[PDB]
Amino acid sequence: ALLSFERKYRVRGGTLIGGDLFDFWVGPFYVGFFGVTTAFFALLGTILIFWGASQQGTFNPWLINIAPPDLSYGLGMAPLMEGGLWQIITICAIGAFVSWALREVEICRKLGMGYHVPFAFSVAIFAYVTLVVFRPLLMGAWGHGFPYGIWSHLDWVSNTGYAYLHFHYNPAHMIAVTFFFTTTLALALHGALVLSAANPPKGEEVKGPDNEDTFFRDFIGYSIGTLGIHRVGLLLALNAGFWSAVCIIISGPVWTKGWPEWWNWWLEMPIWPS
Amino acid sequence: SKFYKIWLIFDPRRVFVAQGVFLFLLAAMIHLVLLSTEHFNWFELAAANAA
Amino acid sequence: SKFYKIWLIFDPRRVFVAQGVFLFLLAAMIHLVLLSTEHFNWFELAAANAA
Amino acid sequence: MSKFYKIWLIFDPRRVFVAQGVFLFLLAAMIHLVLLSTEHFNWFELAAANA
Amino acid sequence: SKFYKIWLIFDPRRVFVAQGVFLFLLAAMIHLVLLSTEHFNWFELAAANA
Amino acid sequence: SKFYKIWLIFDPRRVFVAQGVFLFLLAAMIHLVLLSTEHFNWFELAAANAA
Amino acid sequence: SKFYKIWLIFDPRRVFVAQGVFLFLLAAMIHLVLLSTEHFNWFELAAANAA
Amino acid sequence: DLSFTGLTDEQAQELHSVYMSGLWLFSAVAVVAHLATFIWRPWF
Amino acid sequence: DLSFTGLTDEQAQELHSVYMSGLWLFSAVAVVAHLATFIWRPWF
Amino acid sequence: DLSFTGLTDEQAQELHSVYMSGLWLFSAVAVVAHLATFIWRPWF
Amino acid sequence: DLSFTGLTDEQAQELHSVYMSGLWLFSAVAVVAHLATFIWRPWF
Amino acid sequence: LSFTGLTDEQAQELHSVYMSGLWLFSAVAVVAHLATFIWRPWF
Amino acid sequence: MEETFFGNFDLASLSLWLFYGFFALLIYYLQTENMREGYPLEDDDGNTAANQGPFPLPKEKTFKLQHGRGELTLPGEDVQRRDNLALRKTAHGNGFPMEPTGDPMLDGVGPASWSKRRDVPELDAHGHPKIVPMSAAEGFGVSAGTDPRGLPVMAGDGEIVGLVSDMWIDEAEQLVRYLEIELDPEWGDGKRLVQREMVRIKSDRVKVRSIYGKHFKNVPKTKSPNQVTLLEEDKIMAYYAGGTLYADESRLEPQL
Amino acid sequence: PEYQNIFTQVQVQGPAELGVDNENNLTEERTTGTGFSQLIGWIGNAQLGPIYLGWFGIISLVTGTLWFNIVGFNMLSQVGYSIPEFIRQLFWLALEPPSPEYGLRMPPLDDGGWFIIASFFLLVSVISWWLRSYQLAEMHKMGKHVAWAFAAAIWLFLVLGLFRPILMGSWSEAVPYGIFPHLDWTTAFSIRYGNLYYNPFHALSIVFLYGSVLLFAMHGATILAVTRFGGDRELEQIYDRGTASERAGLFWRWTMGFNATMEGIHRWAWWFAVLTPITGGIGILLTGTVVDNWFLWAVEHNFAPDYTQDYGYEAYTTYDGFLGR
Numbered sequence A: 001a002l003l004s005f006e007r008k009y010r011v012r013g014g015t016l017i018g019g020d021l022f023d024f025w026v027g028p029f030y031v032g033f034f035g036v037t038t039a040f041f042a043l044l045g046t047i048l049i050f051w052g053a054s055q056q057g058t059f060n061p062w063l064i065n066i067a068p069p070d071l072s073y074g075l076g077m078a079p080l081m082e083g084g085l086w087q088i089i090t091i092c093a094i095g096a097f098v099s100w101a102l103r104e105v106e107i108c109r110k111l112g113m114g115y116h117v118p119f120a121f122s123v124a125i126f127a128y129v130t131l132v133v134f135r136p137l138l139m140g141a142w143g144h145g146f147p148y149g150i151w152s153h154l155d156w157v158s159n160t161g162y163a164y165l166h167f168h169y170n171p172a173h174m175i176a177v178t179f180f181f182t183t184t185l186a187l188a189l190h191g192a193l194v195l196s197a198a199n200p201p202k203g204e205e206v207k208g209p210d211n212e213d214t215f216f217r218d219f220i221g222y223s224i225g226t227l228g229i230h231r232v233g234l235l236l237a238l239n240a241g242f243w244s245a246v247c248i249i250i251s252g253p254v255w256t257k258g259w260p261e262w263w264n265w266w267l268e269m270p271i272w273p274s
Numbered sequence B, C, F, G: 001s002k003f004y005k006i007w008l009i010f011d012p013r014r015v016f017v018a019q020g021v022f023l024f025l026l027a028a029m030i031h032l033v034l035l036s037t038e039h040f041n042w043f044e045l046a047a048a049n050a051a
Numbered sequence D: 001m002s003k004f005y006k007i008w009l010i011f012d013p014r015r016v017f018v019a020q021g022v023f024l025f026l027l028a029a030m031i032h033l034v035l036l037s038t039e040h041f042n043w044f045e046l047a048a049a050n051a
Numbered sequence E: 001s002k003f004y005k006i007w008l009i010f011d012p013r014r015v016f017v018a019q020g021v022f023l024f025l026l027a028a029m030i031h032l033v034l035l036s037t038e039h040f041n042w043f044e045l046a047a048a049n050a
Numbered sequence H, I, J, K: 001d002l003s004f005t006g007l008t009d010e011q012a013q014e015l016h017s018v019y020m021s022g023l024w025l026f027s028a029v030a031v032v033a034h035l036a037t038f039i040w041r042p043w044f
Numbered sequence L: 001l002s003f004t005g006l007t008d009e010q011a012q013e014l015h016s017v018y019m020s021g022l023w024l025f026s027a028v029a030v031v032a033h034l035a036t037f038i039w040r041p042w043f
Numbered sequence M: 001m002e003e004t005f006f007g008n009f010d011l012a013s014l015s016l017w018l019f020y021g022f023f024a025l026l027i028y029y030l031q032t033e034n035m036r037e038g039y040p041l042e043d044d045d046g047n048t049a050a051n052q053g054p055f056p057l058p059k060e061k062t063f064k065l066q067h068g069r070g071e072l073t074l075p076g077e078d079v080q081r082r083d084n085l086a087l088r089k090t091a092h093g094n095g096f097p098m099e100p101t102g103d104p105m106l107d108g109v110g111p112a113s114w115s116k117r118r119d120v121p122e123l124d125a126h127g128h129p130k131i132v133p134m135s136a137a138e139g140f141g142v143s144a145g146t147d148p149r150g151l152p153v154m155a156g157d158g159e160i161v162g163l164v165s166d167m168w169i170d171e172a173e174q175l176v177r178y179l180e181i182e183l184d185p186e187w188g189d190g191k192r193l194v195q196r197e198m199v200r201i202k203s204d205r206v207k208v209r210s211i212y213g214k215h216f217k218n219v220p221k222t223k224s225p226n227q228v229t230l231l232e233e234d235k236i237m238a239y240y241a242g243g244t245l246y247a248d249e250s251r252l253e254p255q256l
Numbered sequence N: 001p002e003y004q005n006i007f008t009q010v011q012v013q014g015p016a017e018l019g020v021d022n023e024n025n026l027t028e029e030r031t032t033g034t035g036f037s038q039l040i041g042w043i044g045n046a047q048l049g050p051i052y053l054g055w056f057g058i059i060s061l062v063t064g065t066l067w068f069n070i071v072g073f074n075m076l077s078q079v080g081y082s083i084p085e086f087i088r089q090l091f092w093l094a095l096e097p098p099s100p101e102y103g104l105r106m107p108p109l110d111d112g113g114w115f116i117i118a119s120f121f122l123l124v125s126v127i128s129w130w131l132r133s134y135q136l137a138e139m140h141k142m143g144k145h146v147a148w149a150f151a152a153a154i155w156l157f158l159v160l161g162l163f164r165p166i167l168m169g170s171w172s173e174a175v176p177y178g179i180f181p182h183l184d185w186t187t188a189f190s191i192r193y194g195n196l197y198y199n200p201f202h203a204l205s206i207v208f209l210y211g212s213v214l215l216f217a218m219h220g221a222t223i224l225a226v227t228r229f230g231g232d233r234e235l236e237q238i239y240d241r242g243t244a245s246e247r248a249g250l251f252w253r254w255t256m257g258f259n260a261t262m263e264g265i266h267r268w269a270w271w272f273a274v275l276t277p278i279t280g281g282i283g284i285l286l287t288g289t290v291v292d293n294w295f296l297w298a299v300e301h302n303f304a305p306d307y308t309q310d311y312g313y314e315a316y317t318t319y320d321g322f323l324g325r
Ligand code: BCL
Pocket: A097, A123, A124, A125, A127, A128, A131, A156, A157, A158, A159, A160, A161, A162, A166, A167, A168, A173, A176, A177, A180, A240, A241, A243, A244, A245, A247, A248, N186, N187
C-alpha cells in the first residue's frame, strides 16, 4: 500500500530504460527494468545456492558452502559441482548488485533527489567486486574468491588473513579498520545528538540545531554541524569501504610476503642509527 | 645597500616567527647529522677517550 | 645594542610562554640525550663507582 | 633581578600559578619515576637488598 | 608569612576539589607502589610471618 | 574546631553522591585486594581450616 | 633586459616566499645528495682522512 | 558572611554537626572492624 | 586591594587560618604515620 | 604602566614579594632534601 | 612610532632591561653548571 | 610600495637593527665554527 | 563456569539466546518508532488500505516545541497532508504511477511536490528567524570560496536569467542556504530564491541545471524579502528538484 | 554535473557563536576563546568554538595525561632514553601487562606494576570524561543519549582491561598499551581461545559494526541526496516533516519495502552503534571465563563447516610444477 504522503510522488517517468513498460510498483517496492533483472538474478542466484546446498548434502544455513573451483582451473569455467556453480552465482550476484544500484538510480531520479545512495552502494559493490573477480583475476584463478557460506566465508577471511603471517600489520587494513571504528563512533554520537535534542528530559522543551551545535562545542571543543556530519559521515564510510577494497587487492597481487615485513622500510631507514 | 625594503613586503612579525622556527630546526638538524657520523659524535668521542 | 624593539613586534605574553615551553623541552631533551649515552649517564655511573 | 616583580604584569597570576603547580608536580613525579627505573637509585629495591 | 592571600587569586571551591582529588590519587598511587615492592608489601609480610 | 564552614562552599547534594560512591568503590577495592592475597582470603582460608 | 615587468604579473610577496622555500629545499636536497655519494661525503672523508 | 552555596553560617554549622555524627558513627564501626580483624589475623 | 575571585582580604585571612588547621592536622597524621612506618620497616 | 592583567605596580610587587618568599621556602626544602639524598647515596 | 603590540618605545626598554637581567642570570647559572660538569666529565 | 602598511623610514630602522642582530648571530657562529675546526677539522 | 545447563547449552549459549529475545524486542521497538509518520497506509484511491503491516502503530509521544509553538504528537492526523493534488491514476488498480493533469512543476506533484509545512520561519535559539539575508545579518561576510553575489545565473539550457543580488545565510550555523536571483525582465519580474544545494558556483557564473530559462518566472516567491517561511522553503526547493524530471520531455523519457 | 553537496563552495564567517545558556550558567566554565579554520570549513563548520572545561573534564584531561606520560616515560626508559630509538620503535614499544605469575596481586613496577598505576589513571580519566558527558547533557537540558552511547563503548573498554582480568583472576589478561602490541594481543587473543571468528557475539558485534558503517553510509548519502530539500536540518524535519523526510522515506520504501522517520533513523543509528561493543563486551567476557576454545564450541554446536578435500599442496600441485620447472 501507499503512505499518508506517497501518492503525490508516484509519478510516471524517471526510468533509465524500459519506460512505462515496467514502470509500476509491486507492493511498496518499485519495479523497473532493473527491478525485473534484480528479481531474475537474485532469485536465480538464491535458488542455485539451495540447489548446490541440496547436492552438498546439508540445508543447514551455517553449513551451506558453495566454494570456488580449485586453483588448477585458472580463469576458465569449472564443472558446476566442482566450483562452477559458484561462478554462476557470482555472475548472478554481480548482475543483481549492479541492477540493485541501477534500480536505486531510477528511484532517486523519480523522486528528484541526489544519486548519493547508488554511488555509495557502488562502493560496497566495488568492495565485493574487488573480492570476487578483480583479485582472482590478478591472481590468475577464480579459486581466490571467498566461498558463499555463512561460516564458510569466515574461514576464507581467516586463512587469507594468515596468508600474510599477521594481517593487522597491513597498512591499508589499519586505515580501513580505523575508518570502521570511527564510522561507528560518528554514528553513535550523531545518532545521540539528534535523539538527545529531540528527546529532552520529560517536561522540557525540545532543542534546536543550536543546542546540539553548542553541546559538542562544550564537550569536545568543536562541532562539525548538522550538514557537515553527514558529509564527513558519508566520506568516513565510503573510505571504510574503499580502503577495505585496497587492503585485500594489495594482499597477494602486490604483496606476497608477510605484512610485518612490509614495515621493514621504516625500521631500516638510513637516518636511524645502528 | 638597499635590502631594507624587504620589510615593506614581508610582515616583520610573520617572518621573525618563521625565521626563529627555521633557524632552530636548521641548527638541530646539523647537530643531529653530526651525531650520526662516528667521526664528529662528541658524545662517543668522549666515551672513547679516557677509556 | 638596541634590541628592545623586539617587544614592539612580538607580544611579550606570547613569547614568554613560547620560550618557557621551548626552554624546558630543550633542557629535558638534552638531559635525555646524556642519559642515552654510557659515558654521560650519571645515574649508571654512580652504580659503577659504588661497586 | 630586583625588578622581576613586573613579570606579574605580563602574566596573569591565576593561570601561571595553575601552570606552575601542574608542571612542578609532573616534574617531581617524572624525576622520581626516573630514579625508580635505575638500578642504583631505586630506594625500594635498596631497602630489600639491605635485608 | 602572608600566604593567606593565595585565596585572593585561587577560587576556594576550585582548589579544594583539585586538592581533594589530587591527594587521594596520590595516596592510592603511593600505596600501590608499596604493594609492588617485596619489602614493603604488608600483605606479603604477614604471610612471610606465619 | 572550625571546619563547619566547608559546607559554605560545597553543595551538600553534590558532595554526598561523590562522597558516597567513593566509599563503596574504596570498600569494594580494598575487599578485593584481600581476596587476591593468599594470607587474607577468608573464603580460601576457611577451606584450609576445614582441611 | 626589461625583465622588471615580471613583478606586474607575479605578486612580490607571493614569489618571494615561494623562491625562499624553493632555494632552501634545493640547497638542502643537493647537500643531501652529496652525502649519499661515497666520494663527496665530507663527513666520511674526514674520518678516512684522519686515519 | 561568605558562602558559595547560599547557606548561612548557622545553617551549615548544624549541617556539619549532624554530618560528623554520621562520620563518627561510620568511623566507630570501622574502628571496631579493624580492631576485630587485627585480633583475628594481624597484618603487622 | 587585589582579589581576583572576590572575597575580601579579611575573609581570605580567616579562610587560610582554617585551611592551615586542616593542613597541619593532615600533616600531623601523616608524620605520625610516616614515623610509625619507619620504625616498623625503615626505607633508609 | 604596561599592565596586561590589570595589576598595578604595587600589587605586582606585593604579590611577587610573597611569591619569592614561597619560592625560597620551596627551594630551601629542596636543597635540604637534595643535601640529605647526596649524603645517603651520592650521584657524583 | 612603529608598534604591533601597543607597547610604547619608552616602556619597551623597561621590559627588555629586565629581560636581559633574567637572561644573564639564567645564562650565568648555565655557565657555572656547564663549568661544573666539564670538570666532572669533560666532553672535549 | 608598502604591502605591510609600514613606512620607508621605519623599514630602514627595522633593517638596521635586524642586520646588527644578524651579524651578532653570525659572529658567534664564526667563533663557534672556528673552535670546532680546531677541535675536529672537517677538511 | 564451564558446565552446561543441559546438553550443550552453557552460559555462552544462554547469553546468545538472551540477546535473541532482546534483539527481537528491539527490532519491534525500532520499527514501531519508525511509524510515527505516514500511517495508516491508505491506497491510490485515498481510502484506508486493507493491509496495515505486521507492526501496530506506536503509542503517542508528545514533543514540547520551543518558542511557544505548542505541543506535538506524531501519531495522529498529519497537518502536512496536501489536498486537491493535480494527478490522475493511469490504472484503475493499485501500484501504478499517477499522471499529472497539468504542469507538474506548477501544480507541485512528483519531484516538484512540496509538503504543507508551517507558514512561519524557522527560528534559532534566540527566537528571530534562522535564515536571513546577509544584508540583514550583522558581522557576516565571505571567508572562503567564490562569492556568488553579482555573478550571472545560467539555467539548464544555457540561458542567462539574471544575476545573484544577495544570498541567504543560516547565521545560527554560519552556512549559506539560498541565493537571491534578480530575474531579468526578459525572463522574470522580481527576486527568486535558489537553494545552495542545487546551484554550482563557478569563477564567473553560477549554474543551475535543473531549471530551464523559461521556468524561473514560475519559481515560488516569498511573502517578505527579509525572511522565508517553512512553507515557502518547501515550495521553492521542490520546484527546482522538479525540473530534474520536468524541464523537458527528454529528462522524463527513458535515457535508453 | 549537478552539485553534489560534498564540499561547500562558499563560506560565510560572522561573529563567533559562544553557545546557548540557561539558569545552569554554562558560560562560567567556557574558555571564551574561538578560532575559525577555513580548511575544515569546506566539509563542516569552520568555528573552533570554546570548550566547556569543568571538573570532570579537567580531571579526565589531567589523569589521562598521567596515563599517557607514565606509558610514554616507560617506553622512553625501555629504549634507554634514546630519542631516535624511541621514535623508531614508537609503534612497537608498549607498557606490557603484568606477568601471569602474579595473578591479581600488585606486580613489580618493571613487570607490570607501572601498568596497573597507568591503568588506574586511565580508568579514572575515562570515567571522568563519561561523567562530563552526563553532566553536560543534564546542564544542557537534553537527553543523555551521548552518555548512554559512551557507556556502551566503556563497557567493552571495562571488560577488556578491568572486568575480564578480574574474572580470569590475573592482571595479565589486560591489553598492552602499544600501537602494534594491542594488535598482537588482538591476534593472540583469537589464537589462544580457538578462533574468535566462531564466537557468536564476535560475529554479532561484526553484524552491528558492519551495520553501523552500512547505515551511516546510507544515512549520510540519503541526507545528502535530500539536502536539496533542507534534509540536513533533521531536527526541524522531526517537528515539522518536510518533503526532505518524505522523499528520504519513499526512496527506501520503494527500494527495500520499508523506511524510517527523520527521528527514527537515529534510533536505528544509535542502537546499531551501541550494540557493537555491548555484544563484543559479552563475547570477550565469555572468552576464557567460560569457553576457552571457540572453534570446538562451534563443532559442538554444529555450525563449523566441514571440508572433504585434501589439505596438502601435494594433493593439488607439485613443488616443481609450482616453480615452473
Ligand atoms: C585472520 C583475519 C585477519 C583479517 C583479515 C581480513 C581479510 C582477509 C579481509 C579483511 C577485511 C576487512 N577487515 Mg580485517 N582482518 C583481521 C582483523 C580485523 C579487525 C579486528 C578488530 O581485528 C577488523 C575490524 C577488521 C576489519 C576489516 C575491514 C577492513 C574489512 C571488512 C570487509 C569490508 O569492509 O566490507 C566490504 C564488503 C562488502 C561491502 C560486501 C558488499 C555487499 C554486497 C554489495 C551487498 C550484499 C547483498 C547480499 C546479497 C545480502 C542481501 C540479502 C538480504 C536481501 C539483505 N579486520 C584479522 C587480523 N580482513 C575484508 C575486506 O577488506 O574485504 C574488502 C577482507 O577480505
